[PDB]
């Protein structure tokens, strides 16, 4: 019934642009939106964001994030590792990738979803979310050695699932940094299930 | 270690700008960014609310009521928690019980707030506070709710079973052509991860 009649470009960065969408609405009236959308995209998505299962016998079951200062923020936040999908890359394949370079862990998949959609009121901005396993006990997890690429800084942190809500909220109060909100998302879930 | 040295607009329009972010690496070198914001801010802790809307009724399974709208900048349909703007000098709260009535019709109770969280922190600054309600379905004024939608918008309500949301995400997914939020797919995941 609704549908996009045209698109006009506003202004293209080498990364962003921004885009006045034309739509015709459900009452066959004509209307406008202001639109972001990425112009590395070629993909079933834009990136992969990975749910990172730390499974260590005798401890725990963490949650493996990521804390980078973000400049869109202007400050530090906390996320699950992340990030574009390299043409011609898989998903999955982009998940350990990501996960590797960022965390320094090695995992296996369990799950990968459809295309998700990051802020659809303003972007068309699509990920991956990928559910992947550490298994801490083997020995590539001992020591693991985050492969940053150019200007990448990000600092790991590892929380238990069991209590990952009450956890993120205490770095909110303590640390000022901001929680990412697929993140805040889980976490509350995993307190309202049952 | 890291801030912003400076913010350069580069396109605003009526919704939404993009700007050219300079910013210190922790190296102590001077890099650039592309940063989406919105025009709309002002003295709100976050740009808008989304609301977990847990409905719960005698002799039912709890159901997360979420919603369905045509999202120009994806050019499709997307099921999503509501949401919307924080009005100015409105509370998180007060805007989470206004856009879950607006939006489908129920009346809620508020259960908890978040701080503020980040949409999609590489790309924007843009944040919301996620609010939990509970909806008791039993009450009279929640028994055959009617959608009060502004001027050009339309929503369609979605009551799915917390206790198998994900699968009847991926079903609804797997009939049509539309999208699934990130948040709402996180959530659903988390639930199942219990
Ligand atoms: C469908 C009816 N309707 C019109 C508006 C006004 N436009 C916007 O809020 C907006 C925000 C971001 C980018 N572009 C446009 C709200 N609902
Ligand atoms: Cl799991
Ligand atoms: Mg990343
Ligand atoms: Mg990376
Ligand atoms: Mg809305
Ligand atoms: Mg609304």
Redesign the interface.
């Given at each position: 019934?609704?549908?996009?009649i045209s698109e006009e470009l506003?202004?293209e960065?080498?990364?962003?642009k921004?885009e006045?969408?034309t739509?015709m609405?459900?009452?066959g009236?004509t209307?406008t939106?202001?639109?972001?959308?990425?112009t590395t995209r070629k993909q079933t998505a834009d990136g992969v964001?990975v749910?990172p299962?730390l499974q260590r016998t005798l401890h725990y079951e963490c949650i493996v994030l990521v804390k980078q200062?973000?400049?869109?923020?202007?400050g530090?936040?906390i996320?699950f590792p992340?990030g574009l999908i390299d043409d011609g890359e898989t998903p999955e394949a982009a998940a350990l990738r990501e996960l590797e370079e960022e965390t320094g862990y090695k995992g296996d998949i369990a799950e990968c979803?459809?295309?998700?959609?990051?802020?659809?009121?303003?972007?068309?901005?699509?990920?991956h979310?990928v559910?992947v396993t550490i298994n801490g006990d083997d020995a590539e997890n001992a020591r693991p050695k985050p492969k940053p690429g150019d200007?990448e800084?990000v600092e790991v942190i590892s929380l238990p699932?069991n209590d990952l809500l009450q956890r993120l909220?205490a770095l909110?109060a303590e640390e000022h940094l901001?929680?990412?909100?697929?993140?805040?998302?889980?976490?509350?879930?995993?307190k309202?299930?049952?």
């Amino acid at each position: 019934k609704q549908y996009i009649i045209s698109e006009e470009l506003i202004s293209e960065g080498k990364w962003v642009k921004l885009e006045k969408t034309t739509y015709m609405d459900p009452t066959g009236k004509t209307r406008t939106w202001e639109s972001v959308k990425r112009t590395t995209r070629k993909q079933t998505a834009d990136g992969v964001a990975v749910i990172p299962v730390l499974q260590r016998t005798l401890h725990y079951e963490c949650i493996v994030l990521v804390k980078q200062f973000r400049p869109p923020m202007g400050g530090y936040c906390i996320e699950f590792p992340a990030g574009l999908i390299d043409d011609g890359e898989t998903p999955e394949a982009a998940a350990l990738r990501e996960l590797e370079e960022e965390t320094g862990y090695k995992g296996d998949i369990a799950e990968c979803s459809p295309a998700v959609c990051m802020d659809p009121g303003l972007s068309n901005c699509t990920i991956h979310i990928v559910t992947v396993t550490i298994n801490g006990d083997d020995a590539e997890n001992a020591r693991p050695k985050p492969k940053p690429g150019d200007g990448e800084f990000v600092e790991v942190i590892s929380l238990p699932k069991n209590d990952l809500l009450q956890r993120l909220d205490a770095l909110v109060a303590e640390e000022h940094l901001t929680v990412d909100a697929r993140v805040y998302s889980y976490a509350l879930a995993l307190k309202h299930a049952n």
